[PDB]
Amino acid sequence: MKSLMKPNIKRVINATGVVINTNLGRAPLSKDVINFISEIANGYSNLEYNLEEGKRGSRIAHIEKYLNELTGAESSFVVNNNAGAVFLVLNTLAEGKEVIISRGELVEIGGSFRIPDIMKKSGAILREVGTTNKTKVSDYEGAINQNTALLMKVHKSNFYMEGFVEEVKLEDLVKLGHKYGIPTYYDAGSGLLINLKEFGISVDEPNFRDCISLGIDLVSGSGDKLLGGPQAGIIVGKKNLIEKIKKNPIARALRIDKLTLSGLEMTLKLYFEKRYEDIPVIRMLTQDEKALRQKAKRLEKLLKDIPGLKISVIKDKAKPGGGSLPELELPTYCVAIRHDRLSSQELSRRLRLAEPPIVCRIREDQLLFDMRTVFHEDLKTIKKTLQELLSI
Amino acid sequence: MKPNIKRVINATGVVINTNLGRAPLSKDVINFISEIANGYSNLEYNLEEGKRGSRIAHIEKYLNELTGAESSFVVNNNAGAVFLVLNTLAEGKEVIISRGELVEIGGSFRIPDIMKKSGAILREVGTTNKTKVSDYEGAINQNTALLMKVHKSNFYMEGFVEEVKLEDLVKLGHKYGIPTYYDAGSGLLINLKEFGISVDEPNFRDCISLGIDLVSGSGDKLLGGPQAGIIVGKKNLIEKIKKNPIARALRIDKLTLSGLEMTLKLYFEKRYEDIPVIRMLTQDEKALRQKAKRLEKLLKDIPGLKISVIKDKAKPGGGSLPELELPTYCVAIRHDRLSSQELSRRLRLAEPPIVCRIREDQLLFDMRTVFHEDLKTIKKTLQELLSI
Amino acid sequence: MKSLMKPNIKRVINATGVVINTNLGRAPLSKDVINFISEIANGYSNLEYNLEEGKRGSRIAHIEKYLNELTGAESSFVVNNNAGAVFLVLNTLAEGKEVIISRGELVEIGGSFRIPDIMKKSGAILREVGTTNKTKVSDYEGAINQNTALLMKVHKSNFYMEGFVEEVKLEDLVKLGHKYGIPTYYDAGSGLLINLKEFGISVDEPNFRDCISLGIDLVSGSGDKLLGGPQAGIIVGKKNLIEKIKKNPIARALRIDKLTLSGLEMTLKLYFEKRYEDIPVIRMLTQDEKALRQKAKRLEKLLKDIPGLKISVIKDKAKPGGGSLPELELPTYCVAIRHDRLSSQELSRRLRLAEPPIVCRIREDQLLFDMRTVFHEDLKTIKKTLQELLSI
Ligand SMILES: [K+]
Ligand SMILES: [K+]
Ligand SMILES: [Pt+2]
Ligand SMILES: [Pt+2]
C-alpha cells in the first residue's frame, strides 16, 4: 500500500551460478535485443500490418519464417508460453479423445503447472501407461484404440530419476505413431534450438531441429529457457496441424504481445547470424573455464580492502541450468568470503535486502559467488554494496 | 556334473542384489532350516494337545512384539502381500495413490498391473515428481477403500520433488475413516540409526507406532531373512486378510517358515551381526581394507597380474537403499594378454562363478559382499584360468 | 513374551507310520537336497541371472528343462503351491468364462482350500455337471457352450468313494476337449512323478508323464506330496498355455522362493539320476516288509532293559499316505509298548513334550510305533528318551 512509492520489481545480481533460474527471471536478454524491443514499443509499428499491401497482416508472420528455417519444420506458430502451447495442442487435436503418455512424464513444473491438471482442463482424455520409473514401448502400443488422438512425450525439465528406470526412445515413438497413423507431440520444454554439442557442451538434451528431422509431428518449448529468448510458447511441425491450431479461437487468448514478439524476432536473427555469444543464456553456459577464474580473481582484487573480510577463490563442480539441464555438472570458479562479526547466513540475508540485492549460494557457512552468472558491471556494484554494509 | 543353481561369489559390492539372490542367510538360520527339513516336524501341530495347530502362530507372536502391531500375517512374498491386501479390502473400491509411487520393481511387478488384477480400482493423484496432501484428500469419495503409499525401493528422484509426510496420511485417513496401507517393500524391521547408519528409511516398528493401519515388506531385503511377504497392523483387517481364500495360494512353505522364525529370534536377541545383510552394511571401513589387502597378498604370485587396492564410494544396496552411498575397499586387477571384459566373462563361466564390476578396463572386486572363505577360492580360480 | 526365547518349530519323530502327513510337515527332504539348499542360501547365487550372458535371467529357467524332459510336456512352470497353480490356471484361462467340472470333484483339501471357493475368487465361472457319485461323458459335453473356456478334472487325493460310482475316463475327456476345441486341465494334486507299479505298489494313482502323454493340455500337482520334494505348485503342458500363464501378473505374487527352487532342482536331479531311494517319501512307501520287521526287532532289542516296560512286535495293515493315497493299505511291523506305572495316554503325552518330541498311535491303551516313518538314527534317540521318562 505504501510500498507503491516504488516498483517492486528490481534488477538483481545473480551469484547462484545458476543460468536458467526459475526464480530470478529465467533468461536475461542482450542489449541488442532490448533496444530493438524498446524501439518497437516507443511508437507505432507494423505489428499487425503489411506495408507492401497496405492492409492488415498476421503478427506471427514475422517470426515463423526464422523458426521454419532454423528448425526445418514445415510450419510453426507461437503463443504466450509453453504451458499454453501444451494446452492448445491438446485442446486442438485431442478434445474428447485419448492421449497416451508415460506415467513417468506427468510432471509438475513451477507451482501452478501440472500436466494432468492442464490436460484435464484441455478437454483431452488422459491415458496413462507404464510405471513411474519404467515405461516400455509395449506400454504405449497397448493403449492405442479407436479413440487415441495423440502420442505424447514430456521431457523432464526440472527433475530426473536414477536407479532402475526405463524410457521410450523417440525414434520408437515416431515409428509407433507412423504405424498406427497417430501424430506424435513432444513437449521438450527447454526450447533448445540446436544441438548443444556444437558449443562444446556434450549432452543428450533434445533440440527442435533434431527432434523435427526425426519425424515428430509437433514439438514445443519455452522461449525463456535454453532458447535464451523472451517468454514464449514455441510450436513447430506439420503444416496441417499447426493450421488447426492457429484456427482454435483459444489461440487468440494466448496471442503474444508486441514486446515478446519483437524480442523473439531479434533473438532469432542472432541465431540466424550464428551470433551465439550475443544471447546471454548461451554465452553463460559456454563460458571458458579460464574466463571464470579471470573473473573470480578480478573480483577478489576489489574486495581485499574491506574490513573483517576473509577472501578465497575455489574451483567447484556446479549444476548451472536450473529449469532445463538438471543432471548437468560443469566446473566453475566461485569467490568465497567470510566475515568475523557476522555469520554467512546473516550476511546473505543482509545482501538480499541491499539495493541492489545480491543472491548467492552458501555452503557450510562459507559464502559463495559463482562467477558463471555474474556480469562485468556487477563486480563494481558488489564492492560498493559490501563496504557499505560491513564498514558501516 | 553341474546343477544349474550354484553358489556365486559376489564382488559387486552390492548388498541387496536382485540378480544374485537378494539376502543371503546366516549359518545359524540355515542349519535350523536344515533340521526342520530333514525329518518330520510340528509344522501344523500342537504337541501339548495332540491336535492340529497354526503354522504362522509363532511368527506372528515375534512380529507383534517387535513391531508393536495388534496382529500380523505372512504370505509368500510382498507382491503377494500387496495383491492380497488390495484384493481383500479394496475389491470394486477405489485405492488412492501417488502418481510417483506407481512402481515397477523387478521384471514382473508393476503396482498398477497387479492392482488391476486385484479387483481394486486405481485412483491416481498428484504428479510424477510432486504430490501434496491436498491430492489425496481430493480423490476421496463414497467408494474410497484405501489410502495407499508405496516406498520407492529401487529408484529415487532428485530435483524439484514433493511427497506427503506419512503422519499427514494417517491424520487424513483418521479424518475420513479410511484405512492406510504402506508397502515399505524393504521390510526394514527397526530403526537403522541404531546400527550407526543414519537414514530416513521407514521401518515396520516406527511406521506402526505412527498409526499406519497396515504395513508390508519383503522378508529377503533389509530384514535379511528368507523370501516373504510380511503384513502387520490393525487386527480387524489382518483378520479379513487371513480369511480370504487366496491367502491359501499364498501360504508360506515350511522352509521359509522355519528360516523366518530363526531370523526373528536373532532380532529378538538383538543379534544383528548374525544377519548377513545388516552385518555387511554395518561393516567397518578398516575391516574392508583389511580384507582387501589380505586378498592382494594371495594374488601377487600369479603371472600377468597387475594388482592394486583402491578406495571408492559405491551404492551398496541395490533393491533397497538406492540413495545410499558407502565407501569400501575394492581390489583392482588387470592382465596383460586379456582385456578386463574378457577376463570378467571368463570369471562368470568359472566354477564357482565370480561376478565383478567393470570400470574403464579395470576389473574390481568390492570386498563388501565378499566372504572370508571366498578369498582362497578366488586365488585357486584365477590361477587355473591364467596359467593353464 | 516368554515363549519367544526359543523357536516353536522343532524336529519331531514320527511314529504314526503315515508317510505323507499333513500335520507333521508333509514330505521330508534327503540330506543331499538339504545340503544343496544350504549351499545356495549361505551366500549369493545365480538365482535370477545368466552367467553366460552376464545379465538378468529367469529363475524358473533352471527347472523347466527338467520338468519338460521328465513329464514329456512342451513347456512347464512352477508357483508357490498347488492351490496357487489352480488359482493361476483358472484366473488366466477362464476369467469371466465357464469351467466345466464333475459334481464329484469339487473338493476340500486341507482346511482352507475349497475348489469351488477358490475357483470363485479365481474369476472363473463354475459349471458343475453330473452327480456326486456318478458322472458320465454326457454331463461334460452337455454343458459346453459359447462361454466354455475349460474342461477340468480334480483328482480326489484326500478321500475316495465306494459303491455305485461312475467317473469319466480321462481319455474320453481329452477326446471331448479335442472335439470342441476346449483345453483340459487336470489337478492331479498328488504330483506323483512316475508310475507306482514300477516299485511293486499296484495303484491307479495318476502321475505326470502318463497323464501328459494321454493328451491332457495342463496338469498340476504339489511338490511336497508324492513327488517327495519341497512345497510347490507344478504346472506342465502345452507351451501356448504355459506362456499365457507365465505372463499373468499374479504369477509374480506366486513366485517361488530361493530355498524351494534349490530343493526342487536337487529333488528332480535325483529323479533324473533314478536314485529313488534317496527321496524319503518314495523310500518309505517302497520299504520291504522284511526291512520294517528288521527295524522293529532292532528297536525291541534296545528297549528290553527298561524297567516296567512290556514290549511286543506286531504285524498290521496301515494306511501310510495321509494326503495322497487314502485307499492304499500296506502291511507294516509296529513295535508295541506298555508300562505298568504310566497309562499309554499319559506316556504319549510325555513323548510329545520330549526333546525331540515323539508322536505315535494309541490303540486300546496300547502304544504303537509304526516303523514305516521311523529313521535309523531315531532308534537310539527313542531308547534314551524312554528311559529318561520312565526311570527318572
Ligand atoms: K504476454
Ligand atoms: K514360499
Ligand atoms: Pt506368552
Ligand atoms: Pt525370558
Curated annotation (Swiss-Prot), chain B:
UniProt feature coiled coil, ranges = none
Q: Name one GO molecular function term.
A: identical protein binding
N6-(pyridoxal phosphate)lysine-modified residues are where? 221
InterPro entries on file: PyrdxlP-dep_Trfase (IPR015424), PyrdxlP-dep_Trfase_major (IPR015421), SelA-like (IPR018319), SelA_trans (IPR004534)
Q: Mind listing the UniProt keywords for this protein, alphabetically?
A: Cytoplasm, Protein biosynthesis, Pyridoxal phosphate, Selenium, Transferase
Instruction: Spell out the GO cellular component terms annotated for this protein, sorted alphabetically and separated by semicolons.
Output: cytoplasm
- Which GO terms fall under biological process for this protein? conversion of seryl-tRNAsec to selenocys-tRNAsec; selenocysteine incorporation
**EC number(s) from the headed UniProt entry:** 2.9.1.1
What cofactor does this one take?
Answer: pyridoxal 5'-phosphate
What reaction is this protein's catalytic activity? L-seryl-tRNA(Sec) + selenophosphate + H(+) = L-selenocysteinyl-tRNA(Sec) + phosphate
- Where does this polypeptide localize? Cytoplasm
The family database entries (SUPFAM superfamilies) matched by this protein are listed as:
PLP-dependent transferases (SSF53383)
According to its UniProt record, what is one Pfam family this protein matches?
SelA
| Annotated pathway | Aminoacyl-tRNA biosynthesis; selenocysteinyl-tRNA(Sec) biosynthesis; selenocysteinyl-tRNA(Sec) from L-seryl-tRNA(Sec) (bacterial route): step 1/1
The organism's place on the tree of life at top rank: Bacteria
Q: Does the keyword Cell inner membrane apply?
A: no
The role this protein plays is: Converts seryl-tRNA(Sec) to selenocysteinyl-tRNA(Sec) required for selenoprotein biosynthesis.
Concerning its family, UniProt says:
Belongs to the SelA family.
Q: What is this protein called?
A: L-seryl-tRNA(Sec) selenium transferase
Q: What is the lineage of its organism?
A: Bacteria, Pseudomonadati, Aquificota, Aquificia, Aquificales
